[PDB]
Design a protein around this ligand. Structure first.
Ligand SMILES: CC[C@@H]1C(=O)N(C)c2cnc(Nc3ccc(C(=O)NC4CCN(C)CC4)cc3OC)nc2N1C1CCCC1
Lengths: 132, 289
């Protein structure tokens, strides 16, 4: 089939070994599904830290935006996956990326009560007065 | 041929800067537009007058506008005005920044029951308002149930809507093809408010089950199933919900709950309705209680 589709499914399902195999077989790390979710989005939102790292090491676009305007960092922040937030920031995720409500990962983290995330985002330059 | 970069309403004096492209909405191109003064952002529907052949597309345009502009409710897309130049009709609507239940559905498939309950209640309240104002929507579907920043449902897209003008009026004509065809639309008998209850039935099924109730790979087989009322609710669906689906998805339109009776079903008056859906619910299932 399409290796891209397979890589989307593997990243979602948290299949570490499948992700590596598919990447070695030339799967597009920047494949998108029908609502703009990339493997990085899917891994990030599902808490799959190992897969997030593998994707980033292979040059996955850290600021790809889905149909809502969510970057992987938005999704990680809203789900409370601290380690994934950290690694995304380390690969230069835009800490002030705006979704289509003009919300940044900090807004979303704060709204969901993920306060450890809020503090990390602040550490890496999140602007509380960021505005679209 | 070329859409103006700035939209000027002759009447109200309001001027709107054309922003990012949102997609086609039928014959219309849609854009984020922002008031130059107040800086409010709206969804602009821009229809070329070239595509408004006098038949079913034109008076349809007038009907959508006539009906929508007369509406104002918590669960109906805000109507903010309309105007025209020599080349285009411009409709200013509420921008619904969390897309529609279509996008949700594509990502989530089957929702949890509390989610379905949360969304369905708003859909029903919105539709009750329409029915009380003698409006049948006639084309309720995932793609025209928009969500705002608070994940409140807003009913949009009144392109197939009609106003019941007298009591017991049987509508015989639609200016297009509904997404969910009610059995009475397939028949010669005509139709009325119960077509929205049918579509809400289909929607509820889709939200809970994760696939449409009737649709197959062949339209003929689909239409045949509709007329024979052939569908199956999977056994994992809870009884109250299943029962409510069965009440809505009945061939005889008079046998279905009215929108008010629908609102007052056990499905809504019992069972959990979350105070809030977390924004994660657009992408992954949420945990409750
Ligand atoms: C105005 C028409 C109709 C309507 O009636 N209302 C009320 C509406 C209210 N709000 C929206 N909101 C948004 C709709 C699309 C987008 C967006 O990002 N779209 C695409 C993403 C993929 N890309 C390649 C192309 C752009 C963002 C929206 O909100 C921020 N859309 C509405 N639509 C839709 C407009 C296109 C279909 C119908």
């Amino acid at each position: 089939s399409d290796l891209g589709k397979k890589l989307l499914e593997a990243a979602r399902a948290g299949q570490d070994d499948e992700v590596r195999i598919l990447i070695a077989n030339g799967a597009d790390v920047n494949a998108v599904d029908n609502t703009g979710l990339t493997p990085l989005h899917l891994a990030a939102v599902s808490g799959h830290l190992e897969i997030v790292e593998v994707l980033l090491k292979h040059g996955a676009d850290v600021d790809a935006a889905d149909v809502y305007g969510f970057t992987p960092l938005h999704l990680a922040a809203m789900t409370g996956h601290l380690e994934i937030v950290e690694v995304l920031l380390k690969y230069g995720a835009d800490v002030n990326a705006f979704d289509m409500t003009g919300s940044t990962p900090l807004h979303l983290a704060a709204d969901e009560g993920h306060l450890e995330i809020v503090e990390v985002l602040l550490k890496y330059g999140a602007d509380v007065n960021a505005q679209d | 041929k070329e859409i103006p970069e700035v939209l000027v309403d002759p009447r109200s004096r309001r001027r709107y800067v054309r922003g990012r492209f949102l997609g086609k909405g039928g014959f219309a191109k849609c854009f984020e537009i922002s008031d130059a003064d107040t800086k409010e952002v709206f969804a602009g529907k821009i229809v070329p007058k070239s595509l408004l052949l006098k038949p079913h597309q034109r008076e349809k345009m007038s009907m959508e506008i006539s009906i929508h502009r007369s509406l104002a409710h918590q669960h109906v897309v805000g109507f903010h005005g309309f105007f025209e130049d020599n080349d285009f009709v411009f409709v200013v609507l509420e921008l619904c920044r969390r897309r529609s239940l279509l996008e949700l559905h594509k990502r989530r498939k089957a929702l949890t029951e509390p989610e379905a309950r949360y969304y369905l209640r708003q859909i029903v309240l919105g539709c009750q308002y329409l029915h009380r104002n003698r409006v049948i929507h006639r084309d309720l579907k995932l793609g025209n149930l928009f969500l705002n920043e608070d994940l409140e449902v807003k009913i949009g897209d009144f392109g197939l809507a009609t106003k019941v003008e007298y009591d017991g009026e049987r509508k015989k004509t639609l200016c297009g093809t509904p997404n969910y065809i009610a059995p009475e639309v397939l028949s010669k008998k005509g139709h009325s408010f119960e077509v929205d209850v049918w579509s809400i039935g289909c929607i509820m099924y889709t939200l809970l089950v994760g696939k449409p109730p009737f649709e197959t790979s062949c339209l003929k087989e689909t239409y045949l199933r509709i007329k024979k009322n052939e569908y199956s609710i999977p056994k994992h669906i809870n009884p109250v919900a299943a029962s409510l689906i069965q009440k809505m998805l009945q061939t005889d339109p008079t046998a279905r709950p009215t929108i008010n009776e629908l609102l007052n079903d056990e499905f809504f008056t019992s069972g959990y309705i979350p105070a809030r859906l977390p924004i994660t619910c657009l992408t992954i299932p949420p945990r409750f209680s």
